[PDB]
C-alpha cells in the first residue's frame, strides 16, 4: 500500500491548456507527470519511497567521538577523560542533520571500546572495566580518576567490561525547546548601553548555551597496571523516532568550527564545458 | 481578476501591485496567535493588532551592474519601526509572523532577475579565523541590512578585528550552494514577468515564543540571479524597496526598555 502513483495512459494533444509553460517567479514548481508532455503507456508502479523516509534516512548509527584513556602506574598520563556531547565535530552525521533547521528525536548511544598495549616489553594485564558516566550541566566534574564524583549517586553510568557486546543505552528527547535547533540566528546575551564594559554582553554568534547537553566522563575502574594499556571509547550516535521540521540546502564547502563559518576550499564544483556531455 | 493584481492591507496601510506573480504562504501555514495548548508563559499577552501589524518600509537599496546582493533579518529590520519596535524592546518575549513585500520596478527594455529568499534561522559566516566571533552590532544591522560579496576576504587586523560577517553570494552567506536555496520559501522578481514579490511568513521557531532582541526567526536574502542590463549603459541603477508588515504580533514579559549597544 506504500506504492507510488501509476503512470496513466496519454494520447496526442492539441489543446488550449498547456502544461509545459509555467512561471517559477511564483515560487511554485510545475507539478508535471510525464503523461502531460509525452505520450505514455499505462504502467502499474510497484516502487515505493520506503528507504527515503526520515527514520530510514537517519536509521544508521554514526561515530561522534573517540575518547582516549590510559591505564598506567604514576612515575603525562590520562587516567580519565571528558567529552562535551556534540554531533558537530564529525562531518557526516552533522551534514545529514543540517539538511533541516529543527529536529526532534530520541537517541541511541552505542559504545565500542578497543584497547592495546603501548610498549612491547611490559607484558600482560587483566581484563578492564570502563565507567562511562554522564555528567548533566551543573553537576560536579571529576578532578581525578578516583574522587567522589565517580560514586554516581544521581548520575547515570555504564560499567562496561572488556570483550562484551558494545554497550548501549537510549536517551529521550532532552531539549529545553519543543525541537532541537540545529541553527540559531542569535546570541545568548545582548550588550546594553548601560553595561560597564562590552564583555558583560559579549557572546558567541549562533551559540545557545555552553555545556548544552552535558559531559560524558570515561575512566578505567581498575587499579593501574605496570604495563601501559591505552584504550579508546568510540561513541556511535543513532537518531530514532525522528521528526524534522524545516528543509535547508546541504553544506557545500568544508566545515569550520561548530558554526556555519568557512575558511578553505571554497570551490565545491569542478570544471566541465558547457557543450561537453 | 488576475493573480498579477494584488491588494494587501494591514492596519492603516495598503500595498497595491499590478505586476505580481501570485503570492507565497511559506510552508502552507498562515500566521496565527498562540493556541492555549501550545502556550508556555503564564503572563497575559499584549496583542496590539493594528498598532504593530502594518506595512513598514525599509531603506531603498540601489540595484546596479556590480551589485552582489542584500540581506536583512527579522525582527531586527523592524526594531526601530514604530510601536512594533517599542513593544519588541519593552517585552522579554515576542512572536510575530511577517508579510514581506519587495518592490522592484523597471521598464520592458530592462532585464534582470532577483531571487528573494526567506530563510529560517539565517546564520551567516564570519569574517575571520576565530569561530562565531561576529558581534551583536554587526550581526544585527537594522533596516540598513547587509550586503553579499563575490569572494571571502578574511580579516587580518589582529590589533582590533572588525567582527563582521563575510557573506559570499554563491555560498548564500553560510556555505551552501545558492542553486539549492529554492528549497526555502522564495519568489523571483524577473523584470519581464513581475515587478514585485510577496512572501507571507509564519512564526517558524522551536519555541512557541522567544526573545526578539536576542534572536532572529527569519532572514530575507535578495540576490541577483541574472544581472541588471539596460540598453548599452554601464551606469544603470534601479531601486529595490523592501516592505515588511508583522502579522499576529503578541508579546509577553513586560519590563523596562531594552537599550542595545550599537
Amino acid at each position: 500500500q506504500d506504492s507510488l502513483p501509476d503512470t496513466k495512459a496519454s494520447g496526442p494533444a492539441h489543446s488550449k491548456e498547456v502544461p509545459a509553460l509555467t512561471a517559477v517567479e511564483t515560487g511554485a514548481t510545475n507539478p508535471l507527470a510525464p503523461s502531460d508532455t509525452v505520450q505514455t503507456r499505462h504502467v502499474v508502479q510497484r516502487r515505493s519511497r520506503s528507504e527515503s523516509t526520515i527514520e530510514s534516512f537517519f536509521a544508521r548509527g554514526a561515530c561522534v567521538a573517540i575518547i582516549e584513556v590510559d591505564n598506567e602506574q604514576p612515575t603525562a598520563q590520562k587516567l580519565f577523560a571528558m567529552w562535551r556531547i556534540t554531533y558537530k565535530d564529525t562531518v557526516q552525521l552533522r551534514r545529514k542533520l543540517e539538511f533541516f533547521t529543527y529536529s526532534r528525536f530520541d537517541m541511541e548511544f552505542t559504545f565500542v571500546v578497543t584497547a592495546n598495549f603501548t610498549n612491547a616489553n611490559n607484558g600482560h594485564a587483566l581484563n578492564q572495566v570502563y565507567q562511562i558516566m554522564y555528567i548533566p550541566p551543573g553537576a560536579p566534574t571529576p578532578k581525578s580518576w578516583d574522587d567522589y564524583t565517580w560514586q554516581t549517586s544521581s548520575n547515570p553510568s555504564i560499567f562496561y567490561t572488556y570483550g562484551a557486546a558494545p554497550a548501549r543505552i537510549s536517551v529521550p528527547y532532552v531539549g529545553l525547546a519543543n525541537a532541537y535547533s540545529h541553527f540559531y540566528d542569535g546570541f545568548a546575551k545582548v550588550p546594553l548601553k548601560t553595561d560597564a564594559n562590552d564583555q558583560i554582553g559579549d557572546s558567541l554568534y549562533s551559540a545557545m548555551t555552553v555545556d548544552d547537553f552535558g559531559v560524558l566522563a570515561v575512566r578505567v575502574v581498575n587499579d593501574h597496571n605496570p604495563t601501559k594499556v591505552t584504550s579508546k571509547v568510540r561513541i556511535y550516535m543513532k537518531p530514532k523516532h525522528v521528526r524534522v521540521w524545516c528543509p535547508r540546502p546541504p553544506r557545500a564547502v568544508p566545515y569550520y568550527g561548530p558554526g556555519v563559518d568557512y575558511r578553505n576550499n571554497l570551490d565545491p564544483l569542478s570544471e566541465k564545458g558547457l557543450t561537453t556531455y | 481578476y488576475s493573480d498579477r493584481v494584488l491588494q494587501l492591507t494591514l492596519g492603516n496601510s495598503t500595498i497595491t501591485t499590478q505586476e505580481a506573480a501570485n503570492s507565497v504562504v511559506a510552508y502552507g501555514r498562515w500566521p496565527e496567535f498562540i493556541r492555549d495548548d501550545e502556550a508556555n508563559p503564564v503572563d497575559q499577552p499584549t496583542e496590539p493588532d493594528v498598532a504593530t501589524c502594518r506595512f513598514y518600509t525599509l531603506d531603498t537599496v540601489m540595484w546596479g551592474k556590480e551589485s552582489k546582493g542584500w540581506w536583512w533579518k527579522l525582527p531586527d529590520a523592524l526594531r526601530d519601526m514604530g510601536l512594533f519596535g517599542q513593544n519588541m524592546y519593552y517585552h522579554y518575549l515576542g512572536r510575530s509572523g511577517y508579510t514581506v513585500h519587495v518592490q522592484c520596478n523597471a521598464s520592458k527594455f530592462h532585464q534582470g532577475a532577483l531571487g528573494v529568499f526567506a530563510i529560517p534561522e539565517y546564520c551567516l559566516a564570519g569574517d575571520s579565523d576565530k569561530q562565531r566571533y561576529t558581534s551583536y552590532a554587526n550581526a544585527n544591522p537594522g533596516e540598513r541590512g547587509g550586503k553579499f560579496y563575490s569572494q571571502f576576504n578574511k580579516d587580518n587586523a589582529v590589533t582590533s578585528p572588525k567582527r563582521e560577517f563575510c557573506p559570499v553570494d554563491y555560498l548564500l552567506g553560510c556555505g551552501v550552494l545558492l542553486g539549492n536555496a529554492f528549497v526555502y520559501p522564495h519568489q523571483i522578481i524577473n523584470l519581464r514577468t513581475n515587478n514585485s514579490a510577496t512572501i507571507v511568513l509564519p512564526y517558524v521557531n522551536a519555541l512557541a515564543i522567544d526573545s526578539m532582541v536576542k534572536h532572529n526567526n527569519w532572514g530575507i536574502a535578495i540576490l541577483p540571479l541574472s544581472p541588471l542590463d539596460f540598453a548599452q549603459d554601464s551606469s544603470v541603477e534601479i531601486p529595490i524597496t523592501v516592505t515588511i508588515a508583522p502579522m499576529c504580533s503578541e508579546f509577553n514579559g513586560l519590563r523596562n526598555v531594552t537599550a542595545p549597544k550599537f
Partner: antibody
Amino acid sequence: LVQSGAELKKPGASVKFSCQASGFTFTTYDIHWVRQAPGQGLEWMGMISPSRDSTIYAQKFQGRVTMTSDTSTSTVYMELTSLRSEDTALYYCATASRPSAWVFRSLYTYYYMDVWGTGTTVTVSS
Amino acid sequence: SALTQPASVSGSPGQSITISCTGTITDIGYYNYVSWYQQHPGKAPKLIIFDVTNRPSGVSDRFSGSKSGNTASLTISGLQAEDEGDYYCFSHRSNNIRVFGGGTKLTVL
C-alpha cells in the same frame, strides 16, 4: 630533558634555532616555541608536530618564521627568516606532553607544555 | 590580543592572594584548556595548574584555580616566601592558536 642550541648575536640577518629531545617524545608529542623579551612576558610563537609535520604559527610571525623536523636526530628547528631589534628575547623550546582530560574537538587529546627546555637568548643589535 | 592580568599583586605570609586572568569569549569563556605557569627568575616555567582546578603531581595544595566566565583565577592560600615570582596565565583560542597572559609578579611582603 630537552636541549637547546647556544646564543646568537646578529642584527638584520636570519637566525636558526635547534632543539633536540628523546626519540619517544619527539615522535609522540608536539613541540611548542615560546619567547620572552626581558621583563615583557611569555609569547607563543608556534608549534611543530613531527609525527605528521603539520605546523601552526602565531599571526605575529606567520611570514617570518618556519619550523622543520629531523627524524634521524630527533631534533626540531626554527628559523626567523628576518629579524628586528624587538626580537631580543630568551627563546624557549617546550614539549606539550601533559594531557588534558577534556577531549580536543571530539577525536583528539589536548596537551599542555610541561617539559620546557632551558632555551637560549638571541640579541639583535649592532 | 594577549590575556589581561594585573601587573603585580602583593600579600604577607599566611594570607591568601588571588591572581586573576580575563580573556575574551573565544578563549577562557569557551574552552576549559586554561592553565597557569610559575616562573622564578632565570628558570624555565613550571606548569602548576593544567585544567581548571587541576594540579600536576608535586605541586602543593595551596595552589588552587577556578573559572567564573571570561575570567580565570589562581588562588595561593597560605602564602610563603618561596611563592615569589612571575605567574603566567594561558589558554587555547578558537583559531587554533595559544595565548599567554601578560604576567603577574607576586611580591611576598
